[PDB]
């Protein structure tokens, strides 16, 4: 139905595109791309320290939690 | 209806709480609170340079666009 497709699109817009699973709640402050915290933190801890979207490098001070909804 | 209340809640979560009107697309990087760009930029240009949520001061380098959805 039309209402449900709209719900699905909102859910997708709030969902991390990296895992397609957890909600967006983290920002990389070099490039300002948004993901879930777990995806960014696991990349940081494993030394895969590039933005999943645009490949910009980031370090310990370059990602932080945010709260959208 | 139940579907419509869920849509309304998603819309609200993506909407700037300051104007309750435009979509969230800006972050203050001192405190990491999120608003629309126009609300933050108009506060900056008028020298009302405190976070609408938590009152943290911010300057020219402390707010940037982000793209959620
Ligand atoms: Zn993720
Ligand atoms: Zn990036
Ligand atoms: Zn606003
Ligand atoms: Zn704030």
CATH of the domain at B65: 3.30.40.10
Helix or strand holding residue B33 (H, E):
none
How many structural domains is chain B composed of? 1
**Do the beta carbons of residue B36 and residue B25 sit within 8 Å?**
yes
Residues of B within 8 A of A12 (CB-CB) are 69
Tell me the torsion sign for CA atoms B12, B16, B21, B25.
negative
Documented resolution in Å: 1.8
**Do the beta carbons of residue A29 and residue A64 sit within 8 Å?**
yes
B40 C-alpha to ligand 3 centroid (Å): 7
Contacts of residue A26, Cβ cutoff 8 Å, sequence gap at least 6: A34, A35, A36, A37, A39, A40, A41, A63, A64, A65, A66
A55 C-alpha to ligand 1 centroid (Å): 15
What domain range is A18 assigned to?
1-69
Max CA separation in chain A (angstroms): 44
Measured CA to CA in angstroms, residue B11 lies from A12, A19, A25, A44, B3 at distances of 13, 23, 17, 32, 13
First-residue to last-residue Cα distance in chain A = 25
**Do the beta carbons of residue A39 and residue A18 sit within 8 Å?**
yes
Distance, in Å, from the CA atom of B45 to the CA atom of A52, rounded to the nearest integer, reads 34
Distance, in Å, from the CA atom of A58 to the CA atom of A20, rounded to the nearest integer, reads 22
């Amino acid at each position: 139905e039309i209402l449900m497709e709209e719900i699905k699109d909102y859910k997708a817009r709030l969902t991390c595109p990296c895992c397609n699973m957890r909600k967006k709640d983290a920002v990389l402050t070099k490039c300002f791309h948004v993901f879930c915290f777990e995806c960014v933190k696991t990349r940081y801890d494993t030394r895969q320290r590039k933005c999943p979207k645009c490949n910009a490098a980031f370090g310990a001070n370059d990602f932080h939690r945010i709260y959208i909804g």
